[model samples]
Target: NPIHDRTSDYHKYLKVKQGDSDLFKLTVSDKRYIWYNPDPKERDSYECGEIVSETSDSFTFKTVDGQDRQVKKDDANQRNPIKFDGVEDMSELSYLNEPAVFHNLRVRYNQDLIYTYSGLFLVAVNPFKRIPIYTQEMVDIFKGRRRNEVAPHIFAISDVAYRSMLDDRQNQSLLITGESGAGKTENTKKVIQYLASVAGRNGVLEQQILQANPILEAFGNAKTTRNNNSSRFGKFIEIQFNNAGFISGASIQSYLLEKSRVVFQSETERNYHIFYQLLAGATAEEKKALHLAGPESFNYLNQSGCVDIKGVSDSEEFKITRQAMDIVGFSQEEQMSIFKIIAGILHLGNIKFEKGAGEGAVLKDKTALNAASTVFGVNPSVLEKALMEPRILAGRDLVAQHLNVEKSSSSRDALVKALYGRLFLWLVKKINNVLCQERKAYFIGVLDISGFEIFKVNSFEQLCINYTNEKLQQFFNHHMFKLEQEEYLKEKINDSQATIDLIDGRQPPGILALLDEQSVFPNATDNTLITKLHSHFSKKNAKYEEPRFSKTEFGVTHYAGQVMYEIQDWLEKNKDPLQQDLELCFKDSSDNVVTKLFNDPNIASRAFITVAAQYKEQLASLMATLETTNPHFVRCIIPNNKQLPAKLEDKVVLDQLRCNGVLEGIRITRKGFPNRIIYADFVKRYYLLAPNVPRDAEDSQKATDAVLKHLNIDPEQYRFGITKIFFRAGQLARIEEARE
Candidate 1:
């Protein structure tokens, strides 16, 4: 019947309504009264008190601190009965307020029950320590069970999506999102694991699909203060299946690799894993050939003061990455070339420049340059020329412009960033080529993107990521509202489309369009870009705010919150220019990978599109694909800032709940009709409950009406629509119970 089993503990505690006598027994005699939010600023902060007297409009309660306080009846947020503790779903609680929801999640989290259903969303609290719930037996238990039949879990949600795809012949997507330490990636892996075990043929394709994670992590993940293994990119993995529902192949689409980290990292963070893995795990002979040294020897690795993560062995991880590469169809030669690029980046970081005799930069010592050139298989002299004084076109002559030490250093960093970015994209394409199959019946896509970010000093990268998340959140809102409300007359839903328009619109020239416009001008500066933004949206747009004191920063009210973004280097970052001589130097390289990177026409065509424009286009394409699939959402939560177990900070968790729309989702489901069925389908399945309805009734509406009347359902419990019957939250369960 797709309803909670009345015999189960969950149903007894949560679904059963309290009668008037039971409520009177508690309200008049029980001394367990509590006051919610004694302090308005602090959420979930409650004070214990007893009701001393009651009036028509107010209740006078004596505080535990020996003070008298009066609160209006409507203003008080009541606490639920003690028996409702640790309910699997938040929507079932009688008092579905903020503090009540937080307490429910807290109770469950303390009991090591991290998965809870908040209406249409699954809220997962990250447990820093390992739990035994993700074993293969657990997966098997949730294989085809309905959500209400088992405990709430990631596997349960995954299985639901899988079954829906197979039965309905449609694509499905699981959108997993959270902050850095919120276990988004871990949950994504578990979803893939459940699908592979259930639908796999135990063939080579499944193994290769499983092996793709190690390779992507080594190149796209790094250590930051928030997490030991943080994904620096976004990924959407589509696992394809054949008509028989067996795993056929898969493909991964990655977004916005943090290329700048290749040359720079902040305090207490490290570069990508490949750099440390190559230095710590390469053989003695291989190190000698690549002229490799310890991590401290390279500028990029030593700047952050954090070379290794605790409890992680780089040597062992390097072996796993290499093995994954082999399984993913990288030949021995291709493997060597990949390592060479890694080594070459480190050597390139060590190259130093000095001011020359006149004004141009000069390489006094060529040791680092020679090593990089050797590994990259480029001419050492040409590489040196490109770094120092590359030629530029002037009217009719190509003249070599002298560059100072700062320009030369920046030029070197640009080349390094370009090389690393290109390498990451190439790796993704190769993996896709090997894993993708031509024939497929249906697919399930899992999106594990970076959560909405608001740093102390937000930048261009933050804007791009937050923009993507804003769009995703809007998509979720529209989907939930439309899916549930479409059966009835249309009403206004909360539309963030205004904010989206202000950011991506073209007629009035939104933020990205403005940035692209300023990028092509030769005389544009960061201040000019900010001025343009202010000129367009300072007071005219409610979604945008211009800081009066800060000239280089602007604020955008995203779906999550308002985030101030710094405009410093926005122009250069968007343009992302590389000198012609540098491309020429690498175009003739002897290394096959290096040559392909430069000579590939697809890569070359990317030069014309600014970074923001390209990202917008890619995002548009992704949205188009997502519109064709049925989506499921999983919102992950970090229990504490310290990343410890058994400690959930109320403010931190509460903020996430609000931002992730868990609270709003519950409110909408409670107030609106969440269950609906087409008239024909309802009568076809439930006609037996009413003997007056014919089995082959020509008018579905008449049959549906007859069935409802026969069951004696209250008119207020349901509503009639043009093509469907919409029922309140628990009304459908009553009809289904009668039929059973």
Candidate 2:
């Protein structure tokens, strides 16, 4: 209705026809048009012009200003026909070029049509402002409808996956990928909402699954410069359904949480939401018990220079988070203990160290130390000793070793990071315990993970995330090509397996393996690690490059782009070492949560795996699970960097389109057979078009050919394979209309 409602403000911007708007005009008594840049410096700024004349080298065009201009053929971009404007699917466009795709998306975006189909994948542009399309009424509209019958929507895709699961009786996964602030998390929430509405039993379990979002966001999401509620970790939630197609249970698996964010944040960013939430929302009695103060009083919270997000109330969010935990069946005492750990981390952040006259570091005051110990239920003196001078094993006996100021402060931060990280895992485990059911028959898994990131100073974290995306991109490439050539015949496919092996392979011992080898050496330093990498891959591996301008940095050619990583603290970060004395102190604490966190056998055993090694293993496990399911890819796009509504930055969006393979996907789909069905399935669905054809035809290809010939379909529309019928982009839709 928004499209046709003239009174609506948005409708005014819609292009009713070619040249209907001031930016474009029809002239020269012909239909030929060309896209030209209005401003040379601004690559994204473009205008449409009518072609006046053409030569072997260049063509003259009439500009919107009534002036004639000449441009070379190589520089010209062909414009799609006006009929293709605002097309729901990009694959249907006769001309599949960059500008054509951009214009289609732009036209649709201007009309607030944020979801569009580019062949098999759904491209969702982040509408920074909320739209009214996700209500229960909208859900009802999408229920039981085919993709072609409904507007392109998140609900449509979710319902499609749901119906596919019920019909096919197979596991399914919705892989949502995009950069931060691009609405991956929001779309994830909607997927869950749609499932809970349609497949939900309207019972306590469904409510519990719905309530898990707030708790997870409060603990794992933070305010980064690019996004206000950016998730600082990766999450894969599996919503289990019984054979009746009702929601039965769910489980959440998290990966590589940005543990560094717990102790530090860059400029214009805030720490995890829980810190500000507890500071702003806790009652006076609770604050007194935990000895909490304003966010500005804590070093971890104040260093970032951003304490709160604009238009967001941390206190209100805290209330919602607490209520969500309660709905998920957390006891009152358990909730209090969780907050106590949060407050204890804050206190630990405040405990400062100074250089003593001797060589060791000294804590001149114990105020913050005592507060942390009180909440943690540990001995204050023991905590102080562990932070300043923990005992370590020497040649034959245990000896107390004193750490300098830098080392002591690092130890403190390590403890804080470990506590927060373990607490997040524990929360996931508890939520799973409550939501998991014993009678799961099938499930829909939703993976909401961090996208490819390349910062000014890419470090270990960026490399890990980019590596994950590399594997995912390969998965997508393999799946798309495999679908097109189901017979597994050899054909050219864009593969990144070599790059994956470069980073994670075992034969040559990739970057992660080399780092793991160096982490165990007591004498290895960052220099030593970089040296080892350079010696191994500087000029040897095609995917790696050691930039001559800097010795501490190396570049990897990822599927998205080349990224340079600085080796500042990979050795220390991978080790993630926490002093055993500190662990012993917390293990015997009087607090239940603290004791359980330290005493958990699984956690204790996982300590041996290095951080990078653990991430590699976790990603391998995730990929293994995804391989078993029918995967649906949704690539979310950020229209503008400012995170505002109705403003699309052309270069920014174009880069993403190229990086995420939207354009490449369209190219491949148009070049090859995108729609295919097994011979039997094809005949079963379309045999009605030709009454003479049997539904259970023995030779499905012959039956299919007969049906197409009987319908007078053009021979060029489809081709036949051994086991299936391959149709060009929109050929199947034609047959489907005939059947209907």
Candidate 3:
């Protein structure tokens, strides 16, 4: 059975349509309640949309692909975001902008527009309707026994869209997005759950398939103001479908991970979970096991929030995390080894350092050497040589030539931070690898990123962060919008494709074409922009900088401010399927963790849905096949943000149904009006088809002359007075017939 818990939490929470929802009121208090009846299928005894019925075992619903099937009632709820259908007739539930009224069927209730004394017993339906998804049903339908394996309260729409593209003839990208800290990563995990569950048909060992989040939390996610489990990057999972709907191949595309923040994060909050775990969370025995000190003794972890970050039992988390690590495919030994390394980092930070009598904060420390040897599982001398001299990796060598160097304290810190950071990204990537099929045409990427936040002194990380998102947004617009539409349009018609073929032809350039001019050094274009920007900032000293030989990190590099890092190396390693697969792409760094991953496209898809840009095109495409009756129940929640400040409820959408025409049935029913009206005409002119008709203007005027007629009713109420050609009051009926 489907988990009816979507509403079971409350015996009878206030249904919004019933009135302002007490259920909603209570659920909203915790903010964990993601689902609520904002709008319903029935309201005021007149429905805005249609359902199979208030209660039915099996019902039918219209689908995005323009088909209706007899879906079990439980399954129907999983199809579309909503459970209603016919919305055309519901004259009142046509919006989210107001509270929809629920009615108990009673004569006086209808008269008073109230059932059970106002809205004391009504349920308000959710107004924020989303594009429907189809998973929780598949779980319920196929595996009724282990239904808990299904992500019941998950936001699905993406996997559904992905499933729609299973034929491979038409490629569809699944996007999941919400503000940072909106649980984008968590949802992404669920997307993988669905994709892998469906794709790994032969009971593929879950771990060996695709690591839904191989990069690990330290590497990919971060805590933020909006959400605790905010993903720090974007990833796409492309599951190639063969003719039989079996997974063929797969790849992932990762985007704009804040790598720079890895080395030195001046976080407004505490360091990431790993840091805290390594610092304060390490148990005494664990610290002894690691030859590492605790957070109270480390500078890096306690830099700012030492006093502020209370109640964070990193040690407790370590124990629990080790268990989770095992479940996630990390060998017990590897988990312990990583924990040791994490604890070792604490030791690395404790190394005291003094500036070499230099102008800058040059390190002057030897304690790090001792810490490195015992903590890093390496010889002290090896640590000393690497920091004191130079090391080469990834084609770049960091050779220290300074004799007065402060024993490489900073270098030690940097290495530990970088290693852990890499490990984090690697873990997440690893999870994705486990979750993905081999190689495929396209993939579904889910990204759970932190929502946007405004904090004190937004720094370079913040700038780079948002800027990356801006570019990504543009990329998304290209794929989810213009490109997808373009491809489909080309398939549907030749002329349009031909026209596009003419302009740039089908081999068009993406957003990259616009960034070539912004490369480093005053290429003619840079000279021009540099001259222009010179007027913006006063200092030129921090302006024109020298360049060094770099590895293969290449990107558009259209950065806003100056930052230090081998960014090009990072870029070269990270490239999306530009023009090839994704209409656009961005790179996170110089690593093979490149274009194979994709982020959840929620933000991208929602953005498309917001303008409802595809509505007309979608409707037109299905117009030939669509003629099903639609019933709708709309709960209208008026914008009451100001009533209770701090609480943000968006404005509502008012439902408006105007009779464009009238029906022939009612037109002829009244004496002699020749009811030759078509169904279309009836609906179009429904207002004109008002049953009670006036005998004539003169008769109406004369009837008004009398006391009874003084108060004029439509169509000389004294004669033919009845609404929609129904019954009239006895006195009115008598007067009307007498006049006739």
Tens digits of per-residue lDDT, candidate 2, 1-740, equal 54344544333322232243422122112456888887687766678898899999998999999889999877677676564578788866655667778999999998888899887789999988887777786677678879876668888899999999999999999999899999999999999999999998857888999999899999999999999999999999999999999999999999878888988999999999999999999999889888988988999999989998999999999899999999999998999999999999999999989996787899888899999999999999889999989998886889989998898999999999989988998999999999987779999999998678878899999999999999988889889877756443532222488789888888779999999999999789889999999999989999999998898999999988899999998999888888999998899889989888889966543647888888899999999999999999899999988999989988889889988888888767756665556788777766777857888989888998988888988877676666767667556644654632
Residue 257 displacement (Å), model 1: 0.7
> RMSD of each candidate?
6.6, 6.7, 18.5
* Per-residue lDDT of candidate 3, residues 395-468 (tens digit): 37443343233435545544554445445545655555455565554443333332222233343233333333
Q: TM-score per candidate, in order?
A: 0.87, 0.87, 0.48
**Of candidates 3 and 2, the better by TM-score:** 2
| lDDT scores in order | 0.84, 0.85, 0.35
User: Highest lDDT among the candidates is held by which one?
Assistant: 2
| lDDT of model number 1 | 0.84
Clashes of 3: 135
Candidate structures ordered by lDDT, highest first: 2, 1, 3
In the range 318-417, model 1's lDDT, one tens digit per residue, is 9999999999999989999999999998999999988849787898899999999999999999999998889988859999888888999899998998
Clashing pairs in 1: none
Q: Of 1 and 3, which scores higher on TM-score?
A: 1
lDDT-best of 2 and 3: 2
